[PDB]
Design an enzyme around this catalytic site. Structure first.
Site, PDB file in Angstrom:
ATOM      1  CB  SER A  11       2.360   1.700  -1.303  1.00 53.79           C
ATOM      2  OG  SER A  11       3.400   2.297  -2.611  1.00 53.79           O
ATOM      3  N   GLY A  63       4.467   3.489   2.208  1.00 53.55           N
ATOM      4  CA  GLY A  63       5.969   3.853   2.543  1.00 53.55           C
ATOM      5  C   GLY A  63       7.104   2.584   3.323  1.00 53.55           C
ATOM      6  CG  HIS A 280       0.866   3.844  -5.603  1.00 53.01           C
ATOM      7  ND1 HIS A 280       1.108   5.154  -5.498  1.00 53.01           N
ATOM      8  CD2 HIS A 280       1.451   2.800  -4.995  1.00 53.01           C
ATOM      9  CE1 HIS A 280       1.479   5.274  -4.467  1.00 53.01           C
ATOM     10  NE2 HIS A 280       2.218   3.899  -4.280  1.00 53.01           N
TER      11      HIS A 280
END
EC number: 3.1.1.-
Length: 302
Positions: A11, A63, A280
């Site tokens: 990610s 993931g 993120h």
């Protein structure tokens, strides 16, 4: 001269949260691979510095564990199985760049462990490590509890697997220069800064995560950073140490933050909804990543 290149990773390479997404409409829709991830932006920056990457594949996907470099990835809801990322490499591949590891450590399970908000349905993969221990007690659970030992186990799998990741590259793209990208810093050295909500935000950087849990979370990223650096020194790879220069671009550095908040909204819209960042990189954090990565490649190709 083209530099055949393969971009791989999780990610932090795919850049979950940046939209639009590539493959919007096909099975790789669930990789949440931004069209403008650090790989796309580095490519452009390098091009006008005259370095010409001929990007052969960008198979970063959210993931992705380290062993998905060599095993099929199963996307949520029956999206399907993606093939091993090692499958993108070619013998003529000369440069491989990506970040893998956070998920094998299972930094997602450490977030859900410390947060009951996160323990409810979310698009963040994973389960709390001990789902019975309570969110609140999480800075103990990993510092003194069972979590403490669960950490040293995970950390042992992480080193064996990065070494393995480095070796299949070496096997399949024998001429390839390997660049392992570290993760940028999430929590600052002064956690008190996490206590304020970022300008224009109503939620705190790390939501319901006990303020006492923040310094353990950094302790644990530091470690993963060191595991990754070692892994590369010992495997003949180059490492892009993003943690060491993001000390003022963390989750908590208000408007200079490069990490979108846990509950803050990304740019991702699923039915008429923003999906949160989930810790993120954001636009700023993605520009740092691109810059720092573009920097190393240039170095390495000279």
């Amino acid at each position: 001269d083209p530099v055949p290149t393969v971009f791989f990773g999780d990610s932090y390479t795919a850049n979950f949260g940046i939209a639009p997404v590539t493959n919007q409409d096909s099975e790789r829709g669930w990789c949440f691979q931004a069209k403008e991830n650090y790989p796309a932006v580095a490519t452009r920056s390098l091009a006008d510095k005259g370095i010409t990457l001929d990007v052969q594949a960008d198979v970063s996907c959210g993931g992705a564990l380290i062993h998905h470099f060599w095993e099929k990835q199963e996307l949520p809801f029956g999206a399907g199985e993606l093939p091993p990322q090692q499958d993108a490499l070619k013998q003529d591949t000369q440069l491989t760049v990506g970040s893998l590891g956070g998920n094998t450590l299972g930094f997602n399970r450490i977030l859900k462990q410390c947060s009951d908000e996160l323990r409810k349905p979310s698009l963040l993969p994973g389960d709390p490590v001990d789902g019975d221990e309570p969110a609140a007690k999480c800075g103990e659970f990993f510092g003194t509890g069972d979590g403490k030992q669960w950490l040293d186990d995970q950390f042992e799998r992480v080193g064996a697997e990065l070494e393995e990741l480095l070796d299949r590259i070496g096997y399949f793209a024998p001429d390839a220069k390997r660049v392992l990208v570290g993760y940028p810093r999430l929590v600052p050295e002064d956690t008190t800064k996490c206590l304020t909500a970022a300008p224009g935000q109503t939620q705190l950087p790390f939501a319901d995560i006990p303020q006492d849990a923040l310094p353990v979370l950094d302790q644990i990223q530091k470690r993963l950073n060191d595991a990754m650096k070692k892994a590369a020194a010992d495997g003949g790879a180059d490492f892009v140490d993003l943690y060491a220069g993001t000390g003022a671009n963390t989750a908590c550095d208000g408007a200079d933050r490069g990490i979108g908040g846990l509950l803050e909204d990304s740019q991702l819209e699923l039915l008429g909804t923003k999906i949160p960042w989930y810790a993120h990189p954001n636009d700023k954090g993605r520009d740092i990543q691109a810059k720092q990565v573009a920097d190393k490649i240039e170095e390495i190709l000279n």
